[PDB]
């Protein structure tokens, strides 16, 4: 059913390719920062309370394009870029650790939770853990095919990693401290996966994989062994759909960015695909700040917006 969006603010910003919520202060809770992405460029926004000041962040780099960045363990921040994953102390605020592909290859794909980072490189996977002032590398294997997307959302640490491959057009579940195969799913066609995600809804875990043509697949997921069951496919849009997890009055829903915004939730023990009443939403992230509580940041083609859902 229809979901409305309560616009709170609205700035004109063409070219956003990503946005991530950050906490500059270990002592505050609420997010006070908003990092934007552009072609080869990254910008940062300071959030006061309805006030947007444009800023700079010291460990972070601005001449690259950010694939991800957020609050990591041990009071630190992380900025995975096309060139390197760089760790940053929260206190003084400086690069305390930086990882790079042993041969100068561009990271091409990234995923990261608070303690783990799993990046790809055209067909290779690297697992890194987040220690005090160190990006410690734990293992590195080659995938039969170019990696198109991955996720490591914990369901502490995550014993599982979820990948989407190029040609094979498979969705797989791998063991982290080894990358051993736990389950492979052939998905059909010539459209590669563009977004993959592991999440939980009432009390059950699911695997979500959005293909480049707007097709969304959702499997039930068994953590313990990582086996997918009850494969269902629905269509949401015609353009690549990107899946992001956000919090509602409840604790967890899923925003689907595409030619047709869609929020995924759960009433009983079955999914529901509500339509968001907005032209189109290309990128989004949750945004819990004093300026705006549990809200959201939706980025269009030339607009950045913050607002809330009404309720369920």
Q: Which residues pair with 254 in a beta bridge?
A: 245, 264
Asked if 294 and 288 count as a contact pair (C-beta separation under 8 A), the reply is yes
Residue whose C-alpha is closest to residue 285's, from 301, 293, 296, 275: 296
Q: Which residues pair with 276 in a beta bridge?
A: 3
And the tokens for 16?
């956003």
What one-character-per-residue DSSP string does the chain give? -EE-EEEEEEEE-TT--EEEEE-S-SS--S--EEEEEETTEEEEEEE-SS-EEEE--SSS-SSS-EEEEEEETTTEEEEEESS-EEEEESSS--EEEEE--TT-PPP-EEEE-SSEEEEEETTEEEEEEEETTEEEEEEEEE-SS-EEEEE-------SEEEEEESTT-EEEEEETTT--EEEEEE--SS--EEEEEEEESSS-EEEEEEETTSEEEEEEE-TTT--EEEEEEEE--SS--EEEEE--SSS-EEEEEBSS-EEEEESSSSEEEEEE-SS-B-EEEE---SSSSS-EEEE-SSEEEEEEE---
And the tokens for 118?
């799993």
CA R_g for the chain = 19
Q: How far is residue 77's CA from residue 133's CA, in Å, rounded to a whole number?
A: 11
Asked if 9 and 50 count as a contact pair (C-beta separation under 8 A), the reply is yes
Residue whose C-alpha is closest to residue 244's, from 298, 312, 165: 298
Asked if 261 and 276 count as a contact pair (C-beta separation under 8 A), the reply is yes
Given strand 147-151, what is the order of strands in its sheet? 147-151, 160-165, 170-175, 181-186
And the tokens for 65?
């394009």
The most distant pair of C-alpha atoms in the chain lies apart, rounded to whole Å, by: 50
Q: How far is residue 126's CA from residue 146's CA, in Å, rounded to a whole number?
A: 14
Asked if 196 and 150 count as a contact pair (C-beta separation under 8 A), the reply is yes
Domains detected in the chain: 1-312 (2.130.10.10)
Report the first-to-last Cα separation within the chain, whole angstroms.
Answer: 10
Method by which the model was determined: X-ray
What lies within 8 Å, CB to CB, of 251 at 6+ separation is: none
What lies within 8 Å, CB to CB, of 312 at 6+ separation is: 248, 249, 250, 265, 267
Burial of 177 per CB tally in 10 Å (0-12, 13-18, 19+): exposed
Q: Which residues pair with 126 in a beta bridge?
A: 119, 140
């Amino acid at each position: 059913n229809g979901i409305g969006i309560h616009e709170h603010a609205s700035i004109d910003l063409p070219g956003i390719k990503g946005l991530w919520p950050l906490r500059s202060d270990p002592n505050r809770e609420t997010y006070d920062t908003l990092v934007l992405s552009f072609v080869g460029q990254t910008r940062v926004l300071m959030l006061n309370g309805e006030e947007v000041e444009e800023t700079e962040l010291m460990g972070f780099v601005d001449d690259q394009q950010t694939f991800f960045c957020g609050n990591v363990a041990h009071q630190q921040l992380i900025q995975i870029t096309s060139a390197s994953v760089r760790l940053v102390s929260q206190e003084p605020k400086a690069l305390v650790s930086e990882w790079k592909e042993p041969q100068a290859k561009n990271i091409s794909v990234a995923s990261c939770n608070s303690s783990q980072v799993v990046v790809a490189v055209g067909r290779a996977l690297y697992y890194l853990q987040i220690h005090p002032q160190e990006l410690r590398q734990i293992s590195h294997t080659e995938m039969e095919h170019e990696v198109a997307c991955l996720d490591i959302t914990p369901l502490g640490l995550s014993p599982l990693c979820a990948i989407g491959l190029w040609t094979d057009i498979s969705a797989r579940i791998l063991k982290l401290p080894s990358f051993e195969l736990l389950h492979k799913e052939m998905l059909g066609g010539e459209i590669i996966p563009r977004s993959i995600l592991m999440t939980t809804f009432e009390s059950s875990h699911y695997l979500l994989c959005a293909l480049g043509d707007g097709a969304l697949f959702y499997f039930g997921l068994n953590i313990e062994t990582g086996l997918l069951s009850d494969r269902k496919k629905v269509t949401l849009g015609t353009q690549p759909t990107v899946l992001r997890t956000f919090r509602s009055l409840s604790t967890t829903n899923v925003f689907a960015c595409s030619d047709r915004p869609t929020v995924i939730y759960s009433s009983n023990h079955k999914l529901v695909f509500s339509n968001v009443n907005l032209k189109e939403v290309n990128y989004m992230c949750p945004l819990n700040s004093d300026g705006y509580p549990d809200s959201l940041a939706l980025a269009n083609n030339s607009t950045l917006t913050i607002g809330t859902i009404d309720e369920i």
